[PDB]
């Protein structure tokens, strides 16, 4: 699996690929690993699919509830703190996952949460077996000053590189942009494919 989340001045870009393996056996080429979980919040999942999928549903429920009760969206750091507490509560029988939580409140944020509830904020983050390859691309090519279009291209490149070198990663690249203005928009497939061609790439 490869997931990535980056922040720019007023945006958050999150992307994943879609491969699901049982060992070397590619059982599903189009699983879903990027989810909207609130108006301006997205989550990526890596690790044990069952544990991840349960957590996706809990977060959808818990944030929808919070928003009705409070009439404001949960702060992104509050979402991360909630996951932090849930995962740590069960550390000795853990959710075997790596989570990225990204969104906009008064500012853009990306948080990376591990299976023991450790949560750290960062300007960018990647998770899954393909993440080291993404970290390479991002160290070399990421700028804070990037435009949203430049960011979408950057993540497409990072995940394309990870797909080329991690057999546990593959399938269509899946991208969401999160802005105050339009909210959580999942880019359409035409558009992603189009940029894969314009950048000169594959899968």
């Amino acid at each position: 699996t490869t997931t990535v989340g980056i922040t720019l001045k007023d945006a958050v870009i999150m992307a994943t690929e879609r491969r699901v393996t049982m060992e070397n056996f590619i059982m599903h080429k189009n699983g879903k690993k990027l989810f909207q979980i609130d108006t301006y919040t997205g989550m990526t999942i890596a690790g044990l699919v069952g544990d991840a999928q349960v957590l996706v549903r809990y977060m959808k429920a818990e944030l929808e509830l919070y928003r009705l009760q409070r009439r404001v969206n949960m702060p992104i750091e509050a979402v991360a703190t909630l996951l932090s507490n849930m995962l740590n509560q069960v550390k000795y029988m853990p959710y075997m996952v790596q989570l990225l939580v990204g969104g906009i409140d008064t500012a853009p944020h990306v948080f990376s949460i591990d299976a023991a509830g450790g949560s750290v904020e960062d300007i960018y983050a990647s998770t899954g077996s393909g993440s080291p390859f993404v970290y390479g691309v991002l160290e070399s090519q990421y700028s804070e000053k990037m435009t949203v279009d430049e960011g979408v291209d950057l993540v497409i490149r990072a995940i394309s590189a990870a797909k080329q070198r991690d057999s546990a990663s593959g399938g269509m690249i899946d991208v969401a942009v999160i802005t105050r203005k339009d909210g959580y928009v999942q880019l359409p497939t035409d558009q992603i494919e189009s940029r894969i061609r314009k950048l000169g790439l594959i899968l």
Binding site: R57, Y58, K60, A61, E62, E64, L65, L68, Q69
Partner: protein, 227 residues
């Protein structure tokens, strides 16, 4: 004294304490809902009661989720507790199945909670009635639910002091499949028909939802255009 304990039947098979809980509902201000063309709406009168209150806060229409709303009438604290139960119950269903296929079952779970409190000594009933309206996989839905745990589905209904005025008016004037603006007008009329004449209807709450959309709450200025 067939009158003093939720667990005592009268010789005619009545549960008077439940019927008294129902009188609590009558002290609430009137609210109503009606189905219209590909949608459903709610209007609630608000007994506005001092300029020192924050208006944009405490208010009778409450979203249960993006596709389902409720209005209540009766004891406020009881209402609040029931609306929270409705919200949690909705999310439990969404976690179990991924969605809320039939709003009737949410309502039943709330109605069951209420029925319980009419059968075991040691508790009193909730002095609340609710209207629930939303869109589900069957279509636009409108239910009410009373202190006894009694449920009914309606094309239009009301709760609160002005219930009977609003219901007979709608029995006369109501038509199915109105466009939204005509539905709202009919509603405002019906609500007005329940006031003591020489008594002006102040700005009520209005919320609507049409198939394939989320709920929208009308803001005050949109509402005034109907007054």
């Amino acid at each position: 004294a067939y009158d003093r304990a939720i667990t005592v039947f009268s010789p005619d098979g009545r549960l008077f304490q439940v019927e008294y809980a129902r009188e609590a509902v009558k002290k609430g201000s009137t609210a109503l809902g009606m189905k219209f063309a590909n949608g459903v709406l709610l209007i609630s009168d608000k007994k506005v009661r001092s300029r020192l209150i924050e208006q944009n806060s405490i208010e009778k229409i409450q979203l249960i989720d993006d596709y389902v709303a409720a209005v209540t009438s009766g004891l406020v604290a009881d209402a609040r507790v029931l609306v929270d139960f409705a919200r949690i119950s909705a999310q439990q269903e969404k976690v179990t199945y991924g969605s809320l296929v039939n709003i009737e079952n949410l309502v039943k779970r709330v109605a069951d909670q209420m029925q319980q409190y009419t059968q075991y000594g040691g508790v009193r009933p909730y002095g609340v009635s609710l209207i629930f309206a939303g869109i589900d996989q069957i279509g636009p839905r409108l239910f009410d639910c009373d202190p006894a745990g009694t449920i009914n589905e309606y094309k239009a209904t009301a709760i609160g002091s002005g219930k009977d005025a609003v219901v007979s008016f709608l029995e006369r004037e109501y038509k199915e499949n109105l466009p939204e603006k005509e539905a709202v007008t009919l509603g405002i009329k019906a609500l007005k028909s329940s006031l003591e004449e020489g008594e002006e209807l102040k700005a009520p709450e209005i919320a609507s939802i049409t198939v394939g959309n989320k709920y929208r709450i009308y803001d005050q200025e949109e509402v005034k255009k109907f007054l």
